[PDB]
Design an enzyme around this catalytic site. Structure first.
Site, PDB file in Angstrom:
ATOM      1  N   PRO A 144      27.200  51.643  71.893  1.00  0.00           N
ATOM      2  CA  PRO A 144      28.466  52.075  71.311  1.00  0.00           C
ATOM      3  C   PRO A 144      29.106  53.176  72.154  1.00  0.00           C
ATOM      4  O   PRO A 144      28.423  54.151  72.503  1.00  0.00           O
ATOM      5  CB  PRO A 144      28.048  52.575  69.912  1.00  0.00           C
ATOM      6  CG  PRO A 144      26.607  52.897  70.020  1.00  0.00           C
ATOM      7  CD  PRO A 144      26.056  51.897  70.999  1.00  0.00           C
ATOM      8  N   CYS A 149      32.807  55.097  71.889  1.00  0.00           N
ATOM      9  CA  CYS A 149      34.115  55.479  71.358  1.00  0.00           C
ATOM     10  C   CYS A 149      35.273  55.414  72.378  1.00  0.00           C
ATOM     11  O   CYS A 149      35.189  55.938  73.476  1.00  0.00           O
ATOM     12  CB  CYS A 149      34.021  56.899  70.789  1.00  0.00           C
ATOM     13  SG  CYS A 149      33.223  56.985  69.121  1.00  0.00           S
ATOM     14  N   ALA A 182      31.167  53.663  67.497  1.00  0.00           N
ATOM     15  CA  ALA A 182      31.047  54.311  66.187  1.00  0.00           C
ATOM     16  C   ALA A 182      32.279  54.074  65.342  1.00  0.00           C
ATOM     17  O   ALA A 182      33.366  54.557  65.651  1.00  0.00           O
ATOM     18  CB  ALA A 182      30.829  55.779  66.346  1.00  0.00           C
ATOM     19  N   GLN A 224      28.092  49.697  65.326  1.00  0.00           N
ATOM     20  CA  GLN A 224      27.545  50.951  64.856  1.00  0.00           C
ATOM     21  C   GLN A 224      28.471  51.512  63.784  1.00  0.00           C
ATOM     22  O   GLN A 224      29.678  51.724  64.078  1.00  0.00           O
ATOM     23  CB  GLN A 224      27.442  51.949  66.016  1.00  0.00           C
ATOM     24  CG  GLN A 224      26.797  53.251  65.588  1.00  0.00           C
ATOM     25  CD  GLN A 224      26.836  54.332  66.648  1.00  0.00           C
ATOM     26  OE1 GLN A 224      27.907  54.818  67.032  1.00  0.00           O
ATOM     27  NE2 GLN A 224      25.666  54.736  67.104  1.00  0.00           N
ATOM     28  N   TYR A 283      25.742  64.096  63.951  1.00  0.00           N
ATOM     29  CA  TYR A 283      26.703  63.681  62.952  1.00  0.00           C
ATOM     30  C   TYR A 283      25.971  63.699  61.612  1.00  0.00           C
ATOM     31  O   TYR A 283      24.927  64.352  61.500  1.00  0.00           O
ATOM     32  CB  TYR A 283      27.307  62.323  63.327  1.00  0.00           C
ATOM     33  CG  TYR A 283      28.043  62.401  64.671  1.00  0.00           C
ATOM     34  CD1 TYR A 283      29.212  63.163  64.819  1.00  0.00           C
ATOM     35  CD2 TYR A 283      27.560  61.735  65.789  1.00  0.00           C
ATOM     36  CE1 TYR A 283      29.877  63.238  66.046  1.00  0.00           C
ATOM     37  CE2 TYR A 283      28.210  61.813  67.021  1.00  0.00           C
ATOM     38  CZ  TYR A 283      29.366  62.565  67.146  1.00  0.00           C
ATOM     39  OH  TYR A 283      29.998  62.635  68.378  1.00  0.00           O
ATOM     40  N   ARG A 301      20.314  54.397  65.265  1.00  0.00           N
ATOM     41  CA  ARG A 301      20.142  55.329  66.393  1.00  0.00           C
ATOM     42  C   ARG A 301      19.770  56.653  65.804  1.00  0.00           C
ATOM     43  O   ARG A 301      20.377  57.071  64.823  1.00  0.00           O
ATOM     44  CB  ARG A 301      21.408  55.495  67.264  1.00  0.00           C
ATOM     45  CG  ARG A 301      21.051  55.337  68.716  1.00  0.00           C
ATOM     46  CD  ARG A 301      21.430  56.421  69.657  1.00  0.00           C
ATOM     47  NE  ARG A 301      22.732  56.138  70.201  1.00  0.00           N
ATOM     48  CZ  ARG A 301      23.089  55.924  71.483  1.00  0.00           C
ATOM     49  NH1 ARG A 301      22.299  55.879  72.555  1.00  0.00           N
ATOM     50  NH2 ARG A 301      24.347  55.730  71.671  1.00  0.00           N
ATOM     51  N   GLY A 345      25.858  52.256  79.480  1.00  0.00           N
ATOM     52  CA  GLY A 345      27.206  52.540  78.980  1.00  0.00           C
ATOM     53  C   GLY A 345      28.255  52.828  80.053  1.00  0.00           C
ATOM     54  O   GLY A 345      29.137  51.979  80.375  1.00  0.00           O
ATOM     55  N   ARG A 346      28.240  54.034  80.588  1.00  0.00           N
ATOM     56  CA  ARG A 346      29.321  54.416  81.532  1.00  0.00           C
ATOM     57  C   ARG A 346      29.463  53.472  82.723  1.00  0.00           C
ATOM     58  O   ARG A 346      30.567  53.331  83.270  1.00  0.00           O
ATOM     59  CB  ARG A 346      29.112  55.852  82.006  1.00  0.00           C
ATOM     60  CG  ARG A 346      29.564  56.837  80.932  1.00  0.00           C
ATOM     61  CD  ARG A 346      29.097  58.258  81.129  1.00  0.00           C
ATOM     62  NE  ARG A 346      27.658  58.345  81.133  1.00  0.00           N
ATOM     63  CZ  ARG A 346      26.982  59.479  81.202  1.00  0.00           C
ATOM     64  NH1 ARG A 346      27.632  60.640  81.271  1.00  0.00           N
ATOM     65  NH2 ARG A 346      25.650  59.430  81.221  1.00  0.00           N
TER      66      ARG A 346
HETATM   67  C1  LIG Z   1      33.112  57.054  76.177  1.00  0.00           C
HETATM   68  C2  LIG Z   1      31.741  57.279  75.544  1.00  0.00           C
HETATM   69  C3  LIG Z   1      31.749  57.155  74.171  1.00  0.00           C
HETATM   70  C4  LIG Z   1      30.566  57.366  73.459  1.00  0.00           C
HETATM   71  C5  LIG Z   1      29.373  57.579  74.126  1.00  0.00           C
HETATM   72  C6  LIG Z   1      29.386  57.783  75.525  1.00  0.00           C
HETATM   73  C7  LIG Z   1      30.570  57.603  76.222  1.00  0.00           C
HETATM   74  C8  LIG Z   1      30.555  57.743  77.744  1.00  0.00           C
HETATM   75  N1  LIG Z   1      28.117  57.409  73.375  1.00  0.00           N
HETATM   76  C9  LIG Z   1      26.841  57.597  74.069  1.00  0.00           C
HETATM   77  C10 LIG Z   1      26.605  56.258  74.798  1.00  0.00           C
HETATM   78  O1  LIG Z   1      26.283  55.293  73.801  1.00  0.00           O
HETATM   79  C11 LIG Z   1      25.451  56.357  75.785  1.00  0.00           C
HETATM   80  O2  LIG Z   1      24.333  56.773  75.057  1.00  0.00           O
HETATM   81  C12 LIG Z   1      25.708  57.341  76.944  1.00  0.00           C
HETATM   82  O3  LIG Z   1      26.862  56.952  77.672  1.00  0.00           O
HETATM   83  C13 LIG Z   1      24.497  57.335  77.871  1.00  0.00           C
HETATM   84  O4  LIG Z   1      24.324  56.091  78.484  1.00  0.00           O
HETATM   85  P1  LIG Z   1      24.893  55.891  80.029  1.00  0.00           P
HETATM   86  O5  LIG Z   1      24.225  56.888  80.948  1.00  0.00           O
HETATM   87  O6  LIG Z   1      26.415  56.117  79.986  1.00  0.00           O
HETATM   88  O7  LIG Z   1      24.461  54.518  80.471  1.00  0.00           O
HETATM   89  C14 LIG Z   1      28.077  57.011  71.967  1.00  0.00           C
HETATM   90  N2  LIG Z   1      26.940  57.062  71.259  1.00  0.00           N
HETATM   91  C15 LIG Z   1      26.949  56.565  70.003  1.00  0.00           C
HETATM   92  O8  LIG Z   1      25.960  56.554  69.366  1.00  0.00           O
HETATM   93  N3  LIG Z   1      28.105  56.099  69.443  1.00  0.00           N
HETATM   94  C16 LIG Z   1      29.232  56.082  70.139  1.00  0.00           C
HETATM   95  O9  LIG Z   1      30.239  55.656  69.647  1.00  0.00           O
HETATM   96  C17 LIG Z   1      29.246  56.776  71.328  1.00  0.00           C
HETATM   97  N4  LIG Z   1      30.508  56.978  72.053  1.00  0.00           N
HETATM   98  C1  LIG Z   2      30.054  59.508  68.388  1.00  0.00           C
HETATM   99  C2  LIG Z   2      29.176  59.259  69.594  1.00  0.00           C
HETATM  100  O1  LIG Z   2      27.797  59.405  69.364  1.00  0.00           O
HETATM  101  C3  LIG Z   2      29.586  59.945  70.918  1.00  0.00           C
HETATM  102  C4  LIG Z   2      31.010  60.476  70.890  1.00  0.00           C
HETATM  103  C5  LIG Z   2      31.281  61.076  72.279  1.00  0.00           C
HETATM  104  C6  LIG Z   2      30.069  61.739  72.964  1.00  0.00           C
HETATM  105  N1  LIG Z   2      28.815  61.295  72.724  1.00  0.00           N
HETATM  106  C7  LIG Z   2      27.853  62.054  73.244  1.00  0.00           C
HETATM  107  C8  LIG Z   2      27.949  62.125  74.780  1.00  0.00           C
HETATM  108  C9  LIG Z   2      27.758  63.448  75.535  1.00  0.00           C
HETATM  109  C10 LIG Z   2      27.863  63.479  76.858  1.00  0.00           C
HETATM  110  C11 LIG Z   2      28.158  62.202  77.652  1.00  0.00           C
HETATM  111  C12 LIG Z   2      28.317  61.058  77.007  1.00  0.00           C
HETATM  112  C13 LIG Z   2      28.218  61.025  75.477  1.00  0.00           C
HETATM  113  C14 LIG Z   2      28.596  60.989  71.438  1.00  0.00           C
END
Ligand SMILES: Cc1cc2c(cc1C)N(C[C@H](O)[C@H](O)[C@H](O)COP(=O)(O)O)c1[nH]c(=O)[nH]c(=O)c1N2
Ligand SMILES: CC(=O)[C@H]1CCCN(Cc2ccccc2)C1
Ligand SMILES: Cc1cc2c(cc1C)N(C[C@H](O)[C@H](O)[C@H](O)COP(=O)(O)O)c1[nH]c(=O)[nH]c(=O)c1N2
Ligand SMILES: CC(=O)[C@H]1CCCN(Cc2ccccc2)C1
Lengths: 359, 359
Positions: B22, B24, B56, B98, B182, B230, B324-325
């Protein structure tokens, strides 16, 4: 970076020099595009390219390459493009379209379904048309019907209607497909054009279908929006210097007829050729055309490395760099290139929900 | 390649072990998703990943992090998700979602518009809720309202209604967001939970909100689709061994309560921490949860290198790798990984209109 300088042509300004050239998806049904194209094009536009030219879109049903090609031969067909236009624009890119007629290479299978002419006994096929009743050969053995004068007028009018519809659908850039062995290219080439009327023989007559189609489209296409064409300027058929010299004179004539930019390519008119594929191999040809015809140009076929794109621009070989297959692989290729070439705040070639996190 | 082995959990089979976690997008309006998400999720699914969990999505308005967060607190909100679901399935990926409640971190600005709590004069803001009236601090100073038992009952029912709606929208995988500071995470952590009733104090009481919410959701979520969550299993707050021991005991209780898979993360419950960010740094923590709680797990946070993901699977640290990223940067990342790891016919990780040309 030269690659990330804007470009203005008529009233259109592109945010950088990266163009996505037209790439057939073979996913349309009766010419109508769908969800496949919507995501495909919107995703690539969000990737950062300044210009996105939609795939070869048939001006008439028989002018499709395959049963999967996009068409714009009716208003309903044109209306299907509106959401694509709007998505490309919403991403900050400029929407273009290539309008086309496959000529003797029509009625073929999709590339991953045989890539060959559809057999006589398969109901999905149709009769093709061309300047003269001569097959391409090889995997495309079907002999086309030689066009009549009424045929020539009808197809010119389908190009006009296609351009009318593209205009009204919101495209800001049009490209006439006079390359790659399809109808237009086959009128110009002695290999495929054996006509003895006004549309064959001399340079002027072989040029006539292309120049008259250009002129006819020019009437309905806004003067403030780029009018472009793609043309194969040589074939690698052992006739290269003569063919090139003639192709450059026709490009001089396109310019006199109001063409704003020429996408420089290879003819692919016949199969008996020796094309020297390699990285940026069209660079020098493109440069010659640009310099000698005094017309802006783009080209493709290898430039899909960030240092090769940048180099071509700095050497003034090209005004835009077309990058196709690398965008199939990565629809965010423009962002990859910005990072590679050290562009400042490179992640912001992408929209905010991505750029914030990648910076 | 371990990374490109299928995975089966309940009635769901994933075509490989690459999950898109997930993320956002902050592009929704009043909780309603739109064309931004449609293209975003469909493009990533076409990229090849076996599983795509939608960002989320708030179970209640006040449960959004920001005014751009997706919601599922009403049937119209849930109907918006249906084209997203169907687009993910059409690409051969599995659609997950999620569901979430941001707790004391709610009512904040979009990350690229300050990333801080909305000020009380800004008309966009709302009252937040939490186990106890204690602020996160730092850039999130707003003190939340302490929930009553009636509030706890209501929020549990909102998670139930959200899951019921997700089911009907056609999602095949659900993830309860009990992580990242959260609402759920904050009930578990002694940092944020100072309650003196049945939902605070002892391990049993701090666990209660999470267990009851899970149990409540298990009643409406189909037994034949994966029910996951999670959870932040440590905070890097100087209390790691005790905190992780407790977290693992709760993982056991999740399993006894029907959880199918646990996404292992960090708590982010308070700002006073020292998280050791680095490539694949959660691998060993994840492995410990998996082994000790005897539960399938995924994790994220620097697995976004094909060799790192492969290694974690081979070491049995993880069952799925969440990337993710790297998917924000390149929505076809799974194809890039299949090429890097020398997968047979890697280009066919992608659909035919791309794979044909890239092989
Ligand atoms: C734009 C964006 C948005 C969110 C996130 C990250 C980023 C970059 N991440 C955390 C994400 O799921 C993930 O755990 C992190 O990005 C770490 O994995 P990567 O290193 O990016 O592969 C995240 N985690 C979660 O539980 N719900 C979410 O909606 C979000 N939203
Ligand atoms: C709601 C969700 O768990 C997300 C919202 C944005 C940041 N997330 C946490 C985050 C911190 C640093 C880099 C990537 C992600 C949590
Ligand atoms: C899938 C696909 C589909 C097509 C093409 C190619 C590919 C890969 N190309 C040629 C394309 O525009 C470009 O010239 C080549 O792809 C070479 O550039 P790259 O090396 O890919 O950057 C193309 N040419 C054209 O004029 N109209 C079209 O519709 C198509 N369709
Ligand atoms: C219609 C258009 O000009 C396309 C259709 C398909 C192949 N194109 C030609 C091509 C040859 C080799 C590699 C990529 C592309 C021509």
């Amino acid at each position: 970076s030269a690659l990330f300088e804007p470009y203005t042509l008529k009233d259109v300004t592109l945010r950088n020099r990266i163009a996505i050239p037209p790439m057939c998806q073979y996913m349309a049904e009766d010419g109508l595009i769908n969800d496949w194209h919507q995501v495909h094009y919107a995703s690539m536009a969000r990737g950062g390219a300044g210009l996105l030219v939609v795939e070869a879109t048939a001006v008439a049903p028989e002018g499709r390459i395959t049963p999967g090609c996009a068409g714009i031969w009716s208003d309903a067909h044109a209306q299907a493009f509106v959401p694509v236009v709007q998505a490309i624009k919403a991403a900050g890119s400029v929407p273009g379209i290539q309008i086309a007629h496959a000529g003797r290479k029509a009625s073929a299978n999709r590339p991953w379904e045989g890539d060959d002419h559809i057999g006589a006994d398969d109901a999905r096929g149709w009769e093709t048309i061309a300047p003269s009743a001569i097959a391409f050969g090889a995997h495309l053995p079907n002999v086309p019907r030689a066009m009549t004068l009424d045929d020539i007028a009808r197809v010119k009018q389908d190009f006009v209607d296609a351009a009318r519809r593209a205009r009204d659908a919101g495209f800001e850039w049009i490209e006439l497909h006079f390359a790659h062995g399809y109808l237009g290219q086959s009128f110009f080439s002695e290999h495929s054009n054996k006509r003895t009327d006004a549309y064959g023989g001399s340079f002027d007559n072989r040029s006539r279908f292309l120049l008259e189609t250009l002129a006819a489209v020019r009437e309905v296409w806004p003067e403030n929006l780029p009018l472009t064409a793609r043309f194969g300027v040589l074939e690698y058929d052992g006739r290269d210097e003569q063919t090139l010299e003639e192709s450059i004179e026709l490009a001089r004539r396109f310019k006199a007829g109001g063409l704003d930019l020429l996408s420089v390519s290879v003819g692919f008119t016949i199969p008996e050729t020796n094309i020297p594929w390699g990285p940026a191999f069209m660079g020098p040809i493109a440069e010659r055309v640009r310099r000698e015809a005094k017309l802006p140009v783009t080209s493709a076929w290898g430039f899909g490395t960030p240092q090769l794109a940048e180099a071509a621009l700095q050497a003034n070989q090209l005004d835009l760099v077309s990058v196709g297959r690398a965008h199939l692989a990565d629809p965010h290729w423009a962002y990859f290139a910005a990072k590679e070439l050290g562009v400042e705040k490179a992640s912001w070639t992408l929209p905010a929900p991505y750029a914030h996190w990648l910076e």
